[PDB]
Structure 1
Amino acid sequence: QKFFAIKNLLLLPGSYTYEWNFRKDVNMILQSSLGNDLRVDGASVRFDS
């Protein structure tokens, strides 16, 4: 968890809804080392779980 307001939060007993949205575009979440544009040559897939 990377948010500053939750990353070190202490919780109290209760039921909470933890929700977040991920990236599945290769060009954003897969750093190369020549910057050929992954998004044109191939990539990620699932997030099976």
Structure 2
Amino acid sequence: RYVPFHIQVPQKFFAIKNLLLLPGSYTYEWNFRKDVNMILQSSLGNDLRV
């Protein structure tokens, strides 16, 4: 039940996932969820907040 995890997450947004970025400095921010019902999947589909 307890898992120290480590993952690589890919960029899915169409406008930038294949962009060939030329020289320069660029700000790159993204927002990630903490909601277990969104992030995880359960075989029964039970609530995971409860």
**Which whole-Å CA distance do the structure 2 matches of 1:10 and 1:32 have between them?**
38
Gaps of 5+ in 1: 41-49
Structure 1 runs (4+) deviating above 2 angstroms are none
* Alignment equivalent of 1:30, drawn from 18, 40, 48: 40
Residue 37 of structure 1 aligns to which amino acid in structure 2?
Answer: D
Q: Which runs of 5+ in 2 are unaligned?
A: 1-10
Aligned to 2:24: 14
**Deviation of the 1:5 alpha carbon:** 0.4
**% identity of equivalent residues:** 100
Over aligned residues, Cα RMSD in angstroms? 0.6
TM-score by length of 2: 0.75
Q: Which residue in the other structure is 2:12 paired with?
A: 2
How many residue pairs match? The answer is: 40
